[PDB]
């Protein structure tokens, strides 16, 4: 799919081109989810290991909520780029090959005659 694109960075995580895109707001609901996803991992661990669920490993709880979140910003930063490349790529083609994507014309509903199937 998107691989084989000109300029592809053969093994890079997020090419610097992704600098042009806005950075993910740290409180983006998604990163906040990853946070909660993380807290739960922590709590779950405590549970499976039979420790006071919430009052234990308060250091770990932090490692978790802060590892998942850290991961998020840098992942979302990329997935956001990938999607952004997709448009660059998609929109460009629509133009470079314009005829294939012509802007057809839509008639007003007055002209169009849609068959009326009575409900009766």
């Amino acid at each position: 799919m998107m691989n084989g694109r000109p300029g592809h960075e053969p093994l890079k995580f997020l090419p610097d081109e992704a600098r042009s895109l806005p950075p993910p707001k740290l409180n983006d609901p998604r990163l906040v989810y990853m946070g909660l996803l993380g807290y739960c991992t922590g709590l779950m661990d405590n549970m499976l290991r039979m420790r006071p669920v919430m009052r234990a490993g308060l250091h770990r709880q932090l490692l978790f909520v802060t590892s998942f979140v850290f991961a998020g910003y840098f992942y979302l930063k990329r997935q956001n780029y990938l999607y952004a490349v997709k448009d660059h790529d998609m929109f460009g083609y629509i133009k470079l090959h314009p005829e294939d994507f012509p802007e057809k014309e839509k008639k007003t509903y007055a002209e169009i005659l849609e068959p009326f199937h009575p409900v009766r």
């Binding site: 998604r30 996803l37 739960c40 779950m44 661990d45 549970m47 499976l48 039979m50």
Partner: protein, 344 residues
């Protein structure tokens, strides 16, 4: 195992898939497959129980002949194109061989007989590696060659696997074999979308790995190879009963959990490509897989099976804990669905 040997083997079992993935000269891809075959056989017979020798001798013969067939495809290509690698021009039969062969190493469809049996005689641990770090290698070879393979065969092996996996699983009561059967099924979905959108194969795999790896470390926490054995989970370790419940329903496609996404986007991609015949039948028997998953749910969680007095003794003793990976891979798996858009 003399820890040195453990290192050499483990390195090979790990250099094996990695060479396959990194190289482009098919030959080097073949030896990557060959090294995986050689490295896995020692670990398979670690207990050296009579069942084990049977397991390895089957795994080895099935793996070896497939390896030879993959080499024949590379040897034939070399004469139809001087290149050592499949190209647009490749004779169709040349590629189909590679599909069958690689579908034997991965154990898909009508070649699904070896996996359930080797998964039954190997330890739970080596079971995981045999199921998930040995599927990465062959799949890599296929994903690389996707543009060229046949849409018809893959689909047939895909559908067959789904059915065989499901039907096989319904009867099985041994857990190792229930998982072996599930893997056949999931492996099927993966190979269904390969011709159309390889990138989704890599999602339907990771999710399978993030689902199966927690599931097996669960089976071994209590080292239960029987459902009856996993059913007394409520006494041995009560907390894992909650997540074991969700992970197994996640392995099947039920909608709130992470497991729906792989099936959902594979169905979306197949309908985008117009296989609304194939996709429909797959999704339907996919529902058979959940039936045997929920039957296990019943025994392990929703209903409490009777236990043994000697169990009270095992409770007393501190239970060696499950590694952290269980949690991080249980949650990222049971509930990431709210984050699907970025996964795909």
């Amino acid at each position: 195992m003399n820890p040195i040997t453990l290192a050499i083997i483990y390195f090979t079992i790990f250099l094996g898939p990695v060479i396959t993935m990194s190289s482009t000269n098919l030959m080097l891809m073949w030896v990557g497959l060959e090294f995986s075959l050689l490295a896995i056989i020692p670990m398979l017979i670690n207990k050296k129980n009579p069942r084990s020798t049977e397991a390895a001798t089957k795994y080895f013969v099935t793996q070896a002949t497939a390896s030879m067939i993959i080499l024949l495809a590379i040897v034939l290509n070399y004469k139809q194109l001087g290149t050592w690698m499949f190209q647009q021009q490749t004779n169709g039969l040349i590629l189909n061989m590679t599909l069958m062969a690689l579908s034997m190493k991965l154990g898909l469809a009508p070649f699904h007989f070896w996996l359930p049996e080797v998964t039954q005689g190997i330890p739970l641990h080596m079971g995981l590696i045999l199921l998930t770090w040995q599927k990465i290698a062959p799949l890599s070879i296929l994903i690389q060659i996707y543009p060229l393979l046949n849409s018809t065969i893959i689909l047939m092996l895909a559908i067959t696997s789904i059915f065989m996996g499901a039907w096989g699983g319904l009867n099985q009561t041994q857990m190792r074999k229930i998982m072996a059967y599930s893997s056949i099924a999931h492996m099927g979905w993966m190979l269904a979308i390969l011709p159309y959108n390889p990138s989704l194969t890599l999602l339907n795999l990771m999710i399978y790995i993030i689902l199966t790896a927690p599931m097996f470390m669960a089976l071994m926490l209590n080292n239960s190879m029987t459902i009856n054995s996993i059913s007394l989970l409520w006494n041995k370790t009560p907390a894992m009963l909650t997540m074991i419940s969700l992970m197994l329903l996640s392995l099947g496609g039920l909608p709130p959990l992470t497991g729906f996404l792989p099936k959902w986007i594979i169905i979306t991609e197949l309908m985008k490509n117009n296989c609304l015949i194939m996709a429909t039948l797959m999704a339907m028997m996919a529902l058979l897989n959940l039936f045997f998953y929920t039957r296990l749910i019943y025994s392990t969680s929703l209903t409490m099976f009777p236990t043994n007095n000697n169990s009270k003794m095992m409770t007393h003793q501190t239970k060696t804990k499950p590694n952290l990976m269980f949690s991080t891979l249980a949650i990222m798996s049971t509930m990431t669905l709210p984050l699907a858009p970025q996964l795909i």
